[PDB]
Amino acid sequence: NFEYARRLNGKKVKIFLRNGEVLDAEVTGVSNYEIMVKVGDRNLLVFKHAIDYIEY
Amino acid sequence: PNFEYARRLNGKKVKIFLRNGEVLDAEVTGVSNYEIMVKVGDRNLLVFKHAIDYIEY
Amino acid sequence: IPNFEYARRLNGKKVKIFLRNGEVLDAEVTGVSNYEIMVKVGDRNLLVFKHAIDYIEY
Amino acid sequence: IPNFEYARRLNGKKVKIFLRNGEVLDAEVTGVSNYEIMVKVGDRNLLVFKHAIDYIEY
Amino acid sequence: KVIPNFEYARRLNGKKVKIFLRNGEVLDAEVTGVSNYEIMVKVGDRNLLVFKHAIDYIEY
Amino acid sequence: NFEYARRLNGKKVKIFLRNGEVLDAEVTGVSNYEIMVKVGDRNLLVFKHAIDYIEY
Ligand SMILES: [Cl-]
Ligand code: NA
Ligand code: NA
Ligand code: NA
Ligand code: NA
Ligand code: NA
């Protein structure tokens, strides 16, 4: 049941999305399948399936 | 092992960024484990979550 | 509510299925399982995997 | 998830498998598991993963 | 526990196969192990762990 | 339950991602769905769904 992604809550990370976009993202919440982020003044729900990797 | 944030989007205006590069300016009309129902203008869509990259809300 | 899904509510309806490959199916839905949607497209019978669908207009 | 798949109805049948890579397999189905479809394409035996299939015409 | 139509990939263990990957790469491989989600192979001198989700089909 | 990827913990491997990228990666942790790696001085969380294969 363990996941490392939960430990990224509160960090500001780079999310490398599957299409080539990169989000500079403050992580505000993590669920089994989603990562909630703030990107500047935007709030996003990011699906983990759309992420390739995260630099932190 | 069950909680999801997407359920809280029900009833809200959102921007859905799809894996194909399309962007939907939508109102959410329902959310299930694997689907998000939306209105886009006059159109009614069932959107599979697997086809979504992210949602601005 | 285990296994609630909106897709099976499209059973018996005329829909437009937008596939991940860019194709759009003008379809009549004849069955919906957990992972598949059965459709008629003109004279053709198709088994469509839900994972290959982006969205459905109805 | 109940024990039902429409893909099982295609066992032993001639079908066209439309793959996510754009290929279309003219296939005879020789087995169906939860995640795979076993086929004969000409003289070739293939194990096809369902996740790689967009739809099947039958 | 005896479910014939559960997983065919496990029967590939120890066999020569051609693996067609989702990006168009093709592996001329020998299977050295199979798990629920992975296939272990030798390709030439190289040892690879291949995720099944990255495989389109396998010729055997 | 069993997975081979867990046995790569502590190894330096080449991770071939679905976008065509290769990571020269030291594996520092493995969960059901993630592989934690060091790539040079960068720390990454890599999702297994984004990996095609790993050379080890
Ligand atoms: Cl790909
Ligand atoms: Na969700
Ligand atoms: Na059908
Ligand atoms: Na899969
Ligand atoms: Na790929
Ligand atoms: Na790491």
Structure characterization notes:
Six copies of one chain form a homohexamer. Chain A has 56 residues and is mainly β. Helices cover 0% and strands 57% of the residues of chain A. Chain A has one domain (1-56): SH3 type barrels. Chain A has no helices and five strands. Chain A is globular and about 30 Å long. At the A-B interface, strand 4 of A face strand 5 of B. Chloride ion binds at residues 22-23 of chain E. Chains A, F: Residues 1-56 form the Sm domain. Chains A, F: GO terms for molecular function: RNA binding.
- Percent in helix of chain A: under 10%
How much of the sequence lies in strands of chain A comes to: over 45%
Q: What's the CATH topology label of chain A?
A: SH3 type barrels
Largest interface: A-B, 19 and 17 residues
Order of helices and strands of chain A: EEEEE
How many separate domains make up the residues of chain A? 1
Radius of gyration of chain A over all CA atoms, rounded: 10 Å
What small-molecule ligands were found? chloride ion, sodium ion
Give a count of the beta strands of chain A, DSSP E runs of length 2 or more: 5
Please summarize the sheet with the most strands of chain A. Answer: 5 strands, antiparallel
Level-2 CATH architecture of chain A: Roll
The structure class of chain A reads mainly beta
What separation lies between the terminal Cα atoms of chain A? 22 Å
Q: What is the subunit organization of this protein? A: homohexamer
Q: Going across the major beta sheet of chain A, what is the strand order? A: 4-3-2-1-5
| Shape by Cα distribution of chain A | globular
Q: What is the CATH level 1 assignment of chain A?
A: Mainly Beta
